[PDB]
Amino acid sequence: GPVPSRARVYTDVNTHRPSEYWDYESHVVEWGNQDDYQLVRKLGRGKYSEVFEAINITNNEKVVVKILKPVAAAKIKREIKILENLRGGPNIITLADIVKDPVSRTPALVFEHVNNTDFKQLYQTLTDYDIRFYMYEILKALDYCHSMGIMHRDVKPHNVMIDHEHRKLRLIDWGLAEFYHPGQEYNVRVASRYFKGPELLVDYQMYDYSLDMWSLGCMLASMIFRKEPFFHGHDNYDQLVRIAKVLGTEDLYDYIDKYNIELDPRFNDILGRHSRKRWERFVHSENQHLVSPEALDFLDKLLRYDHQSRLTAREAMEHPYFYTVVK
Ligand SMILES: CO/N=C1/NC(=O)C(Cc2ccc3ncccc3c2)=[SH]1
């Protein structure tokens, strides 16, 4: 069957920790007071939660209240434990409180409010310097969570709140996040279609932090080439075909060979044969200002089929693409 794989960094971070750190099921929640928060307006709804803008009446500060639905069940404890483990980390959303919602009867997470500018309006209007600056800020969050033994598993533009006026960024929505344990097989039904790594698309379960680096690569490609999204699949199968039209089929078949993966036979009639395209094929008069040799070299090292071959978050922070960003 498939050959096993391990992360090449932060491999055994959880194994050395007391079970209290990663055994989220045994965690005991410290409940705050629901009366401290007044709901102001509904912001949105996910498949597992409802999100509201609210006011913390004990300091008149704006907050966000995420009311979890029952569908989460046992997974609610995992999100709370991850948020508490990561609290204070660079560019990680701050969990301010956990209260019991009176109406729902399920847990409500209270977060610091970020005055965000919508990604459809924003991440496609940034200058070359701002793409580099915000990417560097997202990498600080990813290196922190990976160093803490956690994979986000849902990196995408909707999950990055940016206050552009204040040049501040937060990585949010830790509801799919998981603790990395070497040798563990994980669910491949994570991340959003356009940001799913090839390991998810070929049903390889022993993935790691490097999944977040593929998703980050997809975001970078969309910003530098001004294409939303970069890999525009119609479903999870066509998603892999879209990737193969760019990266080629030979390196895809080499990846499947290396990990001894059984590729779903439905790919035999749709993948075709493709060669890797040079990154300059995606450059045009509208996006040429955002493209440099350093941006293309960086993107090339994130968008690799072999998850073990992608840059780690710390290696990405060392890349020349970021030499122009004030540190
Ligand atoms: C389906 O989105 N579920 C979420 N998960 C989070 O962690 C959120 C956190 C968050 C944190 C700060 C915000 N600030 C303003 C608007 C939305 C904000 C959202 S929303």
JSON list of N, CA, C and O in Angstrom, two decimals, residues 7 48 97 102 123 188 259 267 286 319 327:
[
{"chain": "A", "resi": 7, "resn": "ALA", "atom": "N", "xyz": [6.78, 14.76, 8.60]},
{"chain": "A", "resi": 7, "resn": "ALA", "atom": "CA", "xyz": [7.19, 16.14, 8.42]},
{"chain": "A", "resi": 7, "resn": "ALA", "atom": "C", "xyz": [8.70, 16.18, 8.61]},
{"chain": "A", "resi": 7, "resn": "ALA", "atom": "O", "xyz": [9.25, 15.45, 9.47]},
{"chain": "A", "resi": 48, "resn": "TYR", "atom": "N", "xyz": [-20.64, 24.92, 10.11]},
{"chain": "A", "resi": 48, "resn": "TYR", "atom": "CA", "xyz": [-20.58, 24.48, 11.53]},
{"chain": "A", "resi": 48, "resn": "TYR", "atom": "C", "xyz": [-20.80, 25.63, 12.53]},
{"chain": "A", "resi": 48, "resn": "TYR", "atom": "O", "xyz": [-20.83, 25.33, 13.74]},
{"chain": "A", "resi": 97, "resn": "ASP", "atom": "N", "xyz": [-12.53, 34.91, 24.92]},
{"chain": "A", "resi": 97, "resn": "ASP", "atom": "CA", "xyz": [-13.40, 34.20, 25.88]},
{"chain": "A", "resi": 97, "resn": "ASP", "atom": "C", "xyz": [-14.15, 33.07, 25.23]},
{"chain": "A", "resi": 97, "resn": "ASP", "atom": "O", "xyz": [-14.18, 32.94, 24.00]},
{"chain": "A", "resi": 102, "resn": "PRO", "atom": "N", "xyz": [-26.93, 31.32, 25.26]},
{"chain": "A", "resi": 102, "resn": "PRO", "atom": "CA", "xyz": [-28.21, 30.99, 25.87]},
{"chain": "A", "resi": 102, "resn": "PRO", "atom": "C", "xyz": [-29.20, 30.36, 24.87]},
{"chain": "A", "resi": 102, "resn": "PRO", "atom": "O", "xyz": [-29.87, 29.42, 25.25]},
{"chain": "A", "resi": 123, "resn": "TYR", "atom": "N", "xyz": [-7.03, 41.69, -1.77]},
{"chain": "A", "resi": 123, "resn": "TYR", "atom": "CA", "xyz": [-5.84, 40.89, -2.19]},
{"chain": "A", "resi": 123, "resn": "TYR", "atom": "C", "xyz": [-5.60, 40.95, -3.71]},
{"chain": "A", "resi": 123, "resn": "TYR", "atom": "O", "xyz": [-4.51, 40.52, -4.15]},
{"chain": "A", "resi": 188, "resn": "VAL", "atom": "N", "xyz": [-8.72, 13.51, 4.45]},
{"chain": "A", "resi": 188, "resn": "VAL", "atom": "CA", "xyz": [-8.35, 14.34, 3.28]},
{"chain": "A", "resi": 188, "resn": "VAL", "atom": "C", "xyz": [-9.42, 15.36, 2.93]},
{"chain": "A", "resi": 188, "resn": "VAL", "atom": "O", "xyz": [-9.17, 16.23, 2.11]},
{"chain": "A", "resi": 259, "resn": "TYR", "atom": "N", "xyz": [5.29, 7.70, -3.39]},
{"chain": "A", "resi": 259, "resn": "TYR", "atom": "CA", "xyz": [4.52, 7.37, -2.19]},
{"chain": "A", "resi": 259, "resn": "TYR", "atom": "C", "xyz": [3.69, 6.13, -2.34]},
{"chain": "A", "resi": 259, "resn": "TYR", "atom": "O", "xyz": [2.92, 5.79, -1.45]},
{"chain": "A", "resi": 267, "resn": "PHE", "atom": "N", "xyz": [-9.26, 9.23, -12.88]},
{"chain": "A", "resi": 267, "resn": "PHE", "atom": "CA", "xyz": [-8.28, 10.17, -13.45]},
{"chain": "A", "resi": 267, "resn": "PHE", "atom": "C", "xyz": [-7.73, 9.71, -14.80]},
{"chain": "A", "resi": 267, "resn": "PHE", "atom": "O", "xyz": [-7.24, 10.54, -15.56]},
{"chain": "A", "resi": 286, "resn": "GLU", "atom": "N", "xyz": [-1.17, 43.22, -17.44]},
{"chain": "A", "resi": 286, "resn": "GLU", "atom": "CA", "xyz": [-1.90, 43.64, -16.22]},
{"chain": "A", "resi": 286, "resn": "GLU", "atom": "C", "xyz": [-1.21, 43.18, -14.93]},
{"chain": "A", "resi": 286, "resn": "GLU", "atom": "O", "xyz": [-1.44, 43.83, -13.90]},
{"chain": "A", "resi": 319, "resn": "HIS", "atom": "N", "xyz": [13.50, 33.50, 2.15]},
{"chain": "A", "resi": 319, "resn": "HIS", "atom": "CA", "xyz": [13.67, 33.65, 0.70]},
{"chain": "A", "resi": 319, "resn": "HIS", "atom": "C", "xyz": [13.96, 35.09, 0.29]},
{"chain": "A", "resi": 319, "resn": "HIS", "atom": "O", "xyz": [13.43, 36.04, 0.88]},
{"chain": "A", "resi": 327, "resn": "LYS", "atom": "N", "xyz": [12.28, 44.65, 7.96]},
{"chain": "A", "resi": 327, "resn": "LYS", "atom": "CA", "xyz": [12.27, 43.70, 9.08]},
{"chain": "A", "resi": 327, "resn": "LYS", "atom": "C", "xyz": [12.95, 44.34, 10.29]},
{"chain": "A", "resi": 327, "resn": "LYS", "atom": "O", "xyz": [13.98, 44.98, 10.13]}
]
